[PDB]
Amino acid sequence: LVSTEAQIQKMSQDLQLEALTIQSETQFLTGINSQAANDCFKTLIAAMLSQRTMSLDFVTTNYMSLISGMWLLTVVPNDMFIRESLVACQLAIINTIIY
Amino acid sequence: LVSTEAQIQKMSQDLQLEALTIQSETQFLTGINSQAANDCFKTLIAAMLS
Amino acid sequence: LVSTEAQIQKMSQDLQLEALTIQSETQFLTGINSQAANDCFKTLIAAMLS
Amino acid sequence: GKYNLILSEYLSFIYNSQSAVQIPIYYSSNSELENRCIEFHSKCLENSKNGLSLKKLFVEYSDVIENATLLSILSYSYDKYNAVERKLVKYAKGKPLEADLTVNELDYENNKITSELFPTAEEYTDLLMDPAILTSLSSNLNAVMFWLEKHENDVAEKLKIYKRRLDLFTIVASTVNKYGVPRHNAKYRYEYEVMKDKPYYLVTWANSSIEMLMSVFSHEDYLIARELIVLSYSNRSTLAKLVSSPMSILVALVDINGTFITNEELELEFSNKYVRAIVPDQTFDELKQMLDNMRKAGLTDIPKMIQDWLVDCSIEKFPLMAKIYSWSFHVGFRKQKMLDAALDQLKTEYTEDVDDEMYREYTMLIRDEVVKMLEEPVKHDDHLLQDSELAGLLSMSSASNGESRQLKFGRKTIFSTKKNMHVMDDMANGRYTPGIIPPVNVDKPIPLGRRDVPGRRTRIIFILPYEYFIAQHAVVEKMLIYAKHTREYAEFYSQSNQLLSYGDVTRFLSNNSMVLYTDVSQWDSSQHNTQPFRKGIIMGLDMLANMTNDARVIQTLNLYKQTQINLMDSYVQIPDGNVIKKIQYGAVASGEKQTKAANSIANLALIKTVLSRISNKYSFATKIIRVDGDDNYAVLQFNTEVTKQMVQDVSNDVRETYARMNTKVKALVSTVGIEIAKRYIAGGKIFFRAGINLLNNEKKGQSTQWDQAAVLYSNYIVNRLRGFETDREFILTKIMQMTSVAITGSLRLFPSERVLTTNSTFKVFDSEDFIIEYGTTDDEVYIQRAFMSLSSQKSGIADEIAASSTFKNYVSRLSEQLLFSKNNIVSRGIALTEKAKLNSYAPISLEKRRAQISALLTMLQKPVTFKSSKITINDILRDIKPFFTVNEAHLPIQYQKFMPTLPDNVQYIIQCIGSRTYQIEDDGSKSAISRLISKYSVYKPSIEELYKVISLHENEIQLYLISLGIPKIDADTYVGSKIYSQDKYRILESYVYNLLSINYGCYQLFDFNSPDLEKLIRIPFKGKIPAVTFILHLYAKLEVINHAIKNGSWISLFCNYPKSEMIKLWKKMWNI
Amino acid sequence: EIKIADEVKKSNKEESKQLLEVLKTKEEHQKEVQYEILQ
RNA sequence: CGCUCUCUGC
RNA sequence: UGUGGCAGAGAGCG
């Protein structure tokens, strides 16, 4: 993989943070580490094979969660997720990225 | 209710409440707790009834 | 009158003050105290009468 | 965390008695554990104070043993006199040594018995062999014997070290036990009545021999040590001077294969350039004669190593030479007499056969150089020439030594040699008269001081009055501050490193060019540093005086001129018994504000004048000349390729062209190398001279027993990096023995590693060499807060001197030369600044430091104090550390070795990241306000004072600036601009920039701008707090480097530092 | 001075400590400009 | 920038 | 209470 730290260097030099601000972009960096990417990669395949439904838990203040949720909802069929969860995700995306 | 701390940090996240430059935007956070929400909810209705 | 400090917060808010950068609006807040204003108000009328 | 174990073993070994008991004392930053430590302490003292066995309690309070931190160990043991012999008889079963009185030229420089040279104690003097250090030979022997005892059962290469050092120590202890050990008095002197029946130079020989044998790790080291120790017992005048001389030729024999370069812009840049070594044939004959003297003195193995090395002339065996070149200066000083040491210099041969074509050009070049230096300030009418008097009175160095004098401050008598105190005295009695320069003639000859240094002569020091300094000050400061924008001087080439002091041995080297390098240290009494030099400067002053119109400047220049007039005829006070000699010496030396740059000028003119004579026989283009006082090297490039005969003939031409000016010289020409007193390059690789005696000093300082341990550790670290390696355990043994303090005849205290290695005014060493250490824990924070509370102390002597009339008068007289509308802002400031240089007076510093140590001891005995929150550095580092994350990395090897004598770990760092790409943050008070005051004045108000002054209204600030000579319009513009809020921020940025922790000896050399170190330091950027991100990246680099030094392996880092902690830390940033 | 919902002061979330120290920074900077004028 | 120490040219 | 410095740079105290 790319290491967690070098990826955060690239993302932080991109975002151009402010140490004296309440920003809407520090929350992008929450949980970028490996051992979770592995966990998601393992969970998606395991669940689609076993056909176990799977919910979502996300914080609408973060906006990279919703942007990676776009890819997720494209490559995984919607019925694989429990209804209220993807409805919250879709509603979030439509309200605060699109309209 | 919606959580007090979650709503406070969400609002300050939306507003870019700087620390160096003065703003007219710190002052929006005055009185955002619960125990005032219930006071207003109970005040409006009690006044309109009475 | 309004108190001085309550107005100083408003004047600072409209004239958003970066601590580092010297924008010159600090000079707009110079000499805003009470009892200088009474001095002017007395001075003008007393001069135009005298 | 190992020192304390060696401390315990040392205590067990030295005392050994039933009556010898051992009493720890501990501390912890945690309340409960601290109160249990208090308990433990109490019960231990009681039990000791009740003749009860102490060994029982040590199990019960295991908690203190696991979590608490040690401070010290006390010791109750009685007198037990003469225990050194009672231990030492076993290590002395070899035969003692016999001197040989017919070796040294003089009579008293032989190591014969004292009574054969000093029958009366009233004419005895230990100054010709004074170790000058507050630690005894017996201390050194005890340390050596303890080391030998603990290393009595090892079986490895370590045992080969033990056998070697045991044989050496046998030779030494055999020599001492023939007569016995001298016993120190309270002052660490050795009186007549102990040395009456022993050799005069036995102690220095002993100490130097201990220092050498403690630096033996190999067979060749053993050979060198046995071959110097046995000859340094008799020869004390022709040993370091002898063996250290051939090295200057050897550097012209080493082929370069791979090089380091330096730019004009001062940056290293390696080169794969190969350069041969075009050595002539006759210098080999010279070298053989030098080895013949070497053998004739009594050296057998070390000529053999230098002769069999020449069969290959390889650079891999070459550090041996450098090693040898450092083994000569660890034999001691040649502390001879004031008279004969002056007469080493005061022998003159002035002749009416020299040229006049040479001296006139010489005089002119000096004149021209002076004018190039002084054209801009003399013309634009600078304040410092106008106000030269006041400038010199502020810059009076308070060790300056002019003329010991009987003073009186109210109700005391003082015998100060310091010129600041003299000035304070002379202002009162109407005698201060700087325009009337005193003569230097029969009616007032000059005293002397003595500069010793091994392997060379004893040099002399003028001790002048205080008018000469005042005259010379302003002009020499403009000279320096000009010419450090310019080539040809050390002020331009100096910060710390390679890429500096030389920085052009190695651009203009190939098989087309050569370099002539020459030692010019004897050229002080020479016939070309008398009349023409002075008259050249005088002529330049005439030109410069006609190149200005203002009158104070003309006065200052005329005074500097008259100083050169009076110094042209100069006599020298030297007593000898009852009568006093005064010798005609109309020439140049140090002890002046002028000596460095002026000697550089004169050597520059001389070499420029000589170099226009080689042109009669060769075609060359002079690419570079460099002069730093009493040394010089010139590189020169030819129309063709170089030969042996051209180097030889050039050398002969240089020698004879100096001879035409009646000037002695050892002309030395080469292609790859040079040699000067402190350093040299061979094969594109810098070596250094490691000649710093540890256990023997030059003179008697003023420091305590404590601080001499720190100086000795600093010299150890230096010498180790340079190449000369001493056993670190010995150094730690010396540190404990020198920090040991006698509270009574039988009570003695011994501190621990965690008191001596903590960043304070009491620091002595570091737990891991080449690494300053900071504190992430509670405990370092605790004692640092405690000791910072105690550093600030008082001196009643200083209080009464500062309350007298002359000090007040002095501040007033300084004041009244300027405006007269500030009385509580600067007069106190000038007094507070003068206080910083009254402390140079030794009894003030001793009062303060003995008081400081007493305050330390009254909380080493009893339990500890919390010290009330006073913030320090480790408080900050404690908060920065817990948001780091380490991971194993692996850097490759891609950087070249160019300092071979370093330890392999430091070199491994150099062999993985780069050497220096140098940086600057501030070249002194740059920011906004001191570069105005330094234009209209010279005064240097402390940044504390500015941080306060800017916080005051803009009115008395305006008054303060007008009071410093400034007009009103520029003050008005400064207030209108609204820059005071900016200079609060610039000053606090300068406060964080005062952290000098980049240059201790190993951080001195490392490149922190590297790409390889940087890709490991993955700290994301936030912005708008530059100081914090700066220090964070810096501190992370220090973490990586210290782990590398202490463990070899590399690591990466990562700090997703929260914005909250940035802000929480920001207020502690710009304080303390 | 400060009228935060004091239940938020309990939290060692990043945003909460950030908000507290930022508010203290605003108030101390307001005192800085007031000292600047009033001297 | 004021002092002690390291050596530096002296 | 009895005395050994000038300037360059690097540390430690203001």
Side-chain angles (χ1 to χ4, degrees), chain A residues 20-24 27 61, chain B residues 12-13 16-20:
Chain A
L20 298 172
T21 308
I22 311 293
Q23 280 185 350
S24 301
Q27 292 178 357
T61 68
Chain B
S12 300
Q13 181 171 352
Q16 299 290 326
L17 297 179
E18 295 291 332
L20 296 172

Side-chain angles (χ1 to χ4, degrees), chain D residues 352 355 749 915:
Chain D
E352 299 294 332
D355 289 333
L749 188 146
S915 295

Side-chain angles (χ1 to χ4, degrees), chain D residues 312-561:
Chain D
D312 291 333
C313 296
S314 180
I315 192 163
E316 291 292 330
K317 294 183 284 293
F318 180 70
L320 183 63
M321 299 293 171
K323 184 178 261 79
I324 290 165
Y325 184 68
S326 291
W327 281 102
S328 69
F329 299 100
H330 292 286
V331 71
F333 293 90
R334 61 178 298 164
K335 297 187 178 187
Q336 66 189 1
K337 293 179 180 181
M338 291 293 293
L339 182 61
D340 292 329
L343 275 73
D344 291 330
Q345 299 290 321
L346 296 167
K347 292 180 179 68
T348 60
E349 296 295 329
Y350 294 170
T351 307
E352 299 294 332
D353 291 330
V354 301
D355 289 333
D356 295 334
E357 182 178 2
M358 299 289 283
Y359 286 170
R360 294 183 183 281
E361 294 175 356
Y362 179 75
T363 299
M364 175 172 174
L365 292 175
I366 294 162
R367 192 272 305 285
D368 295 331
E369 190 69 26
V370 172
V371 172
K372 287 188 284 187
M373 285 177 178
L374 275 66
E375 182 173 359
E376 294 291 329
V378 171
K379 194 181 287 291
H380 297 294
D381 295 333
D382 190 73
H383 63 278
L384 181 63
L385 297 174
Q386 185 83 0
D387 294 332
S388 65
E389 180 176 358
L390 184 62
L393 292 142
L394 297 176
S395 297
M396 297 300 290
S397 295
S398 299
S400 293
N401 284 327
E403 298 293 335
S404 301
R405 193 173 171 187
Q406 57 177 357
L407 285 174
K408 61 179 180 292
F409 293 92
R411 194 177 292 175
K412 290 176 73 179
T413 62
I414 299 296
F415 295 88
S416 180
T417 59
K418 297 173 272 290
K419 291 180 180 180
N420 189 3
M421 296 171 70
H422 292 177
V423 172
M424 288 181 183
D425 185 73
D426 291 329
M427 278 186 174
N429 291 315
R431 292 181 291 180
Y432 177 64
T433 308
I436 295 171
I437 296 164
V440 291
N441 56 5
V442 67
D443 298 329
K444 184 174 180 180
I446 302 167
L448 290 175
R450 58 178 287 166
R451 185 173 172 83
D452 287 331
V453 61
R456 295 180 65 192
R457 293 186 184 279
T458 295
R459 295 180 72 90
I460 59 170
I461 299 161
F462 288 107
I463 293 165
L464 295 169
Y466 63 93
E467 294 85 3
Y468 290 90
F469 180 83
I470 300 163
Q472 294 185 352
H473 183 264
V475 298
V476 177
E477 289 293 326
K478 297 291 184 187
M479 284 167 73
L480 293 174
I481 293 163
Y482 178 80
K484 66 175 73 177
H485 295 288
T486 305
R487 305 293 295 282
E488 306 290 324
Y489 298 95
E491 58 178 0
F492 180 63
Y493 295 161
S494 292
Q495 298 291 330
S496 293
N497 307 318
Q498 300 295 106
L499 72 96
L500 296 169
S501 296
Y502 293 168
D504 195 352
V505 290
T506 53
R507 287 192 295 272
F508 296 97
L509 303 179
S510 179
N511 61 5
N512 59 359
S513 300
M514 64 178 74
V515 63
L516 63 94
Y517 62 99
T518 297
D519 183 74
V520 302
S521 69
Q522 297 172 358
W523 295 358
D524 293 330
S525 297
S526 294
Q527 184 175 0
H528 69 279
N529 282 325
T530 183
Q531 305 294 105
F533 176 75
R534 302 291 188 185
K535 288 181 183 289
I537 296 164
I538 289 165
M539 290 173 73
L541 293 164
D542 189 0
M543 298 298 288
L544 293 172
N546 288 321
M547 195 172 284
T548 189
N549 291 313
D550 194 357
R552 300 294 302 284
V553 182
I554 293 289
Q555 184 62 39
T556 297
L557 292 167
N558 193 357
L559 291 173
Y560 187 78
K561 185 177 76 171

Side-chain angles (χ1 to χ4, degrees), chain D residues 397 399-401 413 495-496 590 592 596 699-700 996 999:
Chain D
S397 295
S400 293
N401 284 327
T413 62
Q495 298 291 330
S496 293
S590 65
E592 299 181 358
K596 187 184 284 183
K699 67 185 288 185
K700 290 292 285 179
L996 292 171
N999 297 319

